[PDB]
Curated annotation (Swiss-Prot):
Single GO biological process annotation from the record: regulation of translational initiation
Protein name (record): Methionine aminopeptidase 2
Binding site for substrate: H113, H221
Reaction(s) this enzyme catalyzes, per UniProt: Release of N-terminal amino acids, preferentially methionine, from peptides and arylamides
Gene: METAP2
Residue span relative to the full protein: 110 to 478 of 478
Alphabetized UniProt keyword annotations: Acetylation, Aminopeptidase, Cytoplasm, Glycoprotein, Hydrolase, Metal-binding, Phosphoprotein, Protease
E.C. no: 3.4.11.18
Highest classification ranks of the organism: Eukaryota, Metazoa, Chordata, Craniata, Vertebrata
Cofactor names: Co(2+); Zn(2+); Mn(2+); Fe(2+)
Enzyme class: hydrolase
Function field: Cotranslationally removes the N-terminal methionine from nascent proteins. The N-terminal methionine is often cleaved when the second residue in the primary sequence is small and uncharged (Met-Ala-, Cys, Gly, Pro, Ser, Thr, or Val). The catalytic activity of human METAP2 toward Met-Val peptides is consistently two orders of magnitude higher than that of METAP1, suggesting that it is responsible for processing proteins containing N-terminal Met-Val and Met-Thr sequences in vivo.
Length: 360
């Protein structure tokens, strides 16, 4: 009925009749706040409500994380503590409710897609800049939302720059808005910031090959990309679409490349059923189909299901194009990267920043 400290009560039990809190509602940028639109919006109320339940789990998990995340903890300890909480609040139930993708805790010049695999001894340090990026879902309605953790105030202005650029992207987004215009607007704001870190000055660079993305049911990246620099596609955002608006700022080259051991994997959404006779590969694909479907997973999540010595079977599925690997994405050695991300609903009546909290 009432949430505990530490959080343990599922969000569904905190609401009496399955009506979850709305996120931040915004008027679209320059007639909708329309009977045709109001009815069209109401027709998807069950869907918006699923996003809101997942968003409330995301808000409660991240507030709890911020209370205890500290240097000295291992990255595994952080991810396990966060994920244990997330499973409880979302009331994990197979593909009906659960974790939408692994917990990113990328450090320093690593901007995204790093989560420890078994045996990783990495310890969070006082000077680290850590991007906590995790997702929850109800019925495949995904919340993709992220923030940056630091302990040293030297990164405060870099975080402020990226947060403002993400908020600028969110404000610019709308029905019939050109994706390229969102990218231009984000870049102008991010580049308006100069920061000083350890006696060196930088003009914050958007990471040009990182992007926001449309979201589909059980589909983290549905096909449209939201650039964070100028020169993109004039393709428009459409009514009823859902987007992850994320921005990344860097003190390095402002470009990422694959680096480090891969931890994130996801079945290719478009690949059809593929009969497998190789026993270990067949078993692993069945495990993936049963537990994740088209949602992303990580090696730790296969380990927890009691799977072991599966790396060759996993490589086989990647080589067949059934599963895609998503390795960590890093800028140059010595650079600092920061990220903020929210999920927005392009509802017929308004734009809802469904994952907005009192934090960011
Ligand atoms: O970089 S992405 O592949 C992408 C961005 C634009 C078009 S495709 N990607 C989606 C994703 C892919 C695999 C995962 F296991 C989890 C997520 C961004 C992202 N990661 C975390 N939050 N957001
Ligand atoms: Mn994310
Ligand atoms: Mn994303």
């Amino acid at each position: 009925k009432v949430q505990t400290d530490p959080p343990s009560v599922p969000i569904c039990d905190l609401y009496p009749n399955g009506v979850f809190p709305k996120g931040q509602e915004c008027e679209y940028p320059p007639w909708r706040t329309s009977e045709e639109k109001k009815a069209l919006d109401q027709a998807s109320e069950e869907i918006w409500n699923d996003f809101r339940e997942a968003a409330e789990a995301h808000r409660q998990v991240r507030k709890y994380v911020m209370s205890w995340i500290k240097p000295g903890m291992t990255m595994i300890e952080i991810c396990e503590k966060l994920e244990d909480c997330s499973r409880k609040l979302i009331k994990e139930n197979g593909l009906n409710a659960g974790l939408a993708f692994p917990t990113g805790c990328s450090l320093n010049n690593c901007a995204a897609h790093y989560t420890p695999n078994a045996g990783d001894t990495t310890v969070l340090q006082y000077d680290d800049i850590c991007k906590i990026d995790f997702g929850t879902h109800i019925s495949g309605r995904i919340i993709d939302c992220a923030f940056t953790v630091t302990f040293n105030p030297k990164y405060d202005t870099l975080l402020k720059a990226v947060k403002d650029a993400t908020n600028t992207g969110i404000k610019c987004a709308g029905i019939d808005v050109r994706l390229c215009d969102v990218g231009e607007a984000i870049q102008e704001v991010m580049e308006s910031y100069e920061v000083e870190i350890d006696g060196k000055t930088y003009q914050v660079k958007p990471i040009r090959n990182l992007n926001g993305h449309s979201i589909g049911q059980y589909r983290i990246h549905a096909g449209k990309t939201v650039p964070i620099v100028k020169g993109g596609e004039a393709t428009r955002m459409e009514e009823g679409e859902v987007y992850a608006i994320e921005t990344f700022g860097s003190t390095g080259k402002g470009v990422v490349h694959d680096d480090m051991e891969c931890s994130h994997y996801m079945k290719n959404f478009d690949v059809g059923h593929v009969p497998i006779r190789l026993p270990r590969t067949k078993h692993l694909l069945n495990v993936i189909n049963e537990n994740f479907g088209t949602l992303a997973f990580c090696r730790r999540w296969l380990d927890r299901l009691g799977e072991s010595k599966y790396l060759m079977a996993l490589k086989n599925l990647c080589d067949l194009g059934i599963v895609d690997p998503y390795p960590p994405l890093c800028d140059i050695k010595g650079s600092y990267t920061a990220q903020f991300e929210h999920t927005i609903l392009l509802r017929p009546t308004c734009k809802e920043v469904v994952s907005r909290g009192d934090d960011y």
